[PDB]
Every structure is written in C-alpha cells, then in structure tokens.
Design a protein around this ligand. Structure first.
Ligand SMILES: *[C@@H]1O[C@H](CO)[C@@H](O[C@@H]2O[C@H](CO)[C@@H](O)[C@H](O)[C@H]2NC(C)=O)[C@H](O)[C@H]1NC(C)=O
Ligand SMILES: [O-][O-]
Ligand SMILES: [Cu+2]
Length: 223
C-alpha cells in the first residue's frame, strides 16, 4: 500500500499531486486486464492535474513514494510495508496532451526496472529504505514533447496464485525537451503487457525462495 504522489525534477519536488495523477486510496490494482493497470483507476479514483512538468531529455526524475497522500515522513513505514517485496519499473508513453490523455492502450515503452539483484535484494527494498526515492532516467534519444510517465512498484508477497500480485502505479505528465528523436521505441499496451501467467506475476517468493526474478513486460529501452 503506497502511492507515487510527487515527482522530483531538476532536483526540485514538483508538489503533491502536481503533474502526477494521484489516487485517493493507496490500495493496489490486481487485475492486469483492467484499464486501471495503465494509470491506476477504478475501483479507486484518480485525480486529474493540469500541470505538465518540463524535463530535459537525458536527465533523471525521481518518483517519490509514500504510504498515503497525507504522509509527512520518509522512514520505511512512511513508504511501504516491508512485506511488499518486488520490482520497481517505469515506462513512458508519447501522447498528444499529457494533461488529458488516458494512458490506456498501446505506446508504452519501459525505461527503468529493478527486480532482484545478485545479492537477493528487491527493487522495492531500495525504495522503502531509500526515503521513497525511485530514480528514473529519461532517455536522451527519444522524440521531444508530451509524454506520460508510469512509475510502478509490484508487491509479490501474496502472488503465489493469480490474482495475487499487487500493482501500485501512477502516471506523471511530462514535456520532454531536448530529445533528439534518434531512436523510436517499440511499444506495448496497458492492459496487455502483463499476464496473470507471467513468471514475475504468478510467483511464490518463499516456496522455494527465489534467487532470480523476471520482471514482467518488455525489455528496457536503451539509446
Ligand atoms: C537515474 O536513473 C537510473 C535508472 O533509470 C539510475 O541507474 C541505475 O542506478 C543504480 C544505482 O547506482 C544502478 O545499480 C543501476 O545499474 C543503474 N541502471 C542503469 C540502467 O544504469 C541512475 O543511478 C539514476 N541517477 C540518479 C541520480 O538517481
Ligand atoms: O498490500 O497487501
Ligand atoms: Cu499493501
């Protein structure tokens, strides 16, 4: 239970729900076939925001994860419960109007992931124990203009069967400046990119303990 409730750009937090479409409640999506898997949604409610955040291509933005919208600290419990082990992931989608585009459908490409490292530590544990900071590089080589940024944490502690995996995601609204357009990503759809049968979705993280993890979705796009 967690929310990507603000984005840091150029080292400055852009504000709570400012340029990030935040849900009222911190619960997960569990149905990977739902329209809500793209940018969150029903049975939650997600707020619209008029802010589109300018970001220089090639630089990092940092999603700031918090337990609830009103949370005021950054200790582990202020981010997400330590039972919630799994990957962190981020995607972009080119859109016409980042303040209104829904994010459902084709156009997503993966730009970051952190599953399980060679020491058995999960991406979510780096966020939980890193003050909620989920750093994401905006590629330098993509086309400039308006995008959605979907940042996600998947908790797998209850994922031995499907449904069970818990998907926490929010979409931020970006204007990417300086992108060279030198490379056009291949894209996937949300819903569509994840299946309840995926090895990273239906998984028993303790039975036996896993030492390798396959993050769901496509490969990370690189310039
Ligand atoms: C910018 O974001 C990228 C991820 O998109 C970060 O790159 C990862 O950094 C970790 C921590 O050093 C490494 O273990 C990974 O190997 C890196 N991944 C890649 C693909 O390079 C990068 O550290 C971020 N920069 C900042 C300032 O947070
Ligand atoms: O969230 O369990
Ligand atoms: Cu939870």
């Amino acid at each position: 239970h967690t929310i990507f409730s603000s984005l840091e750009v150029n080292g400055v937090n852009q504000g709570l729900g400012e340029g990030v479409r935040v849900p009222t409640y911190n619960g997960p999506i569990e149905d990977v076939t739902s329209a809500s898997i793209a940018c969150n949604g029903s049975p939650n409610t997600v707020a619209s925001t008029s802010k589109v955040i300018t970001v220089q291509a090639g630089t990092n933005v940092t999603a700031i994860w918090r337990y609830m919208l009103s949370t005021t600290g950054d200790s582990p419990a202020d981010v997400m419960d330590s039972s919630h082990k799994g990957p962190t992931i981020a995607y972009l989608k080119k859109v016409d109007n980042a303040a209104t585009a829904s994010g459902v459908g084709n156009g997503w490409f993966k730009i970051q992931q952190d599953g399980m490292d060679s020491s058995g530590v999960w991406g979510t544990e780096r966020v939980i124990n890193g003050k909620g900071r989920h750093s994401i590089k905006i590629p330098e080589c993509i086309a400039p203009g308006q995008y959605l940024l979907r940042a996600e944490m998947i908790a797998l502690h209850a994922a031995s069967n499907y449904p069970g995996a818990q998907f926490y995601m929010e979409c931020a609204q970006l204007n990417v400046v300086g992108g060279t357009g030198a490379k056009t990503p291949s894209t996937v759809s949300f819903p569509g990119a994840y299946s309840g049968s995926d090895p990273g979705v239906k998984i028993s993280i303790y039975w036996p303990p896993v030492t390798s993890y396959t993050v769901p979705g496509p490969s990370v796009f690189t310039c």
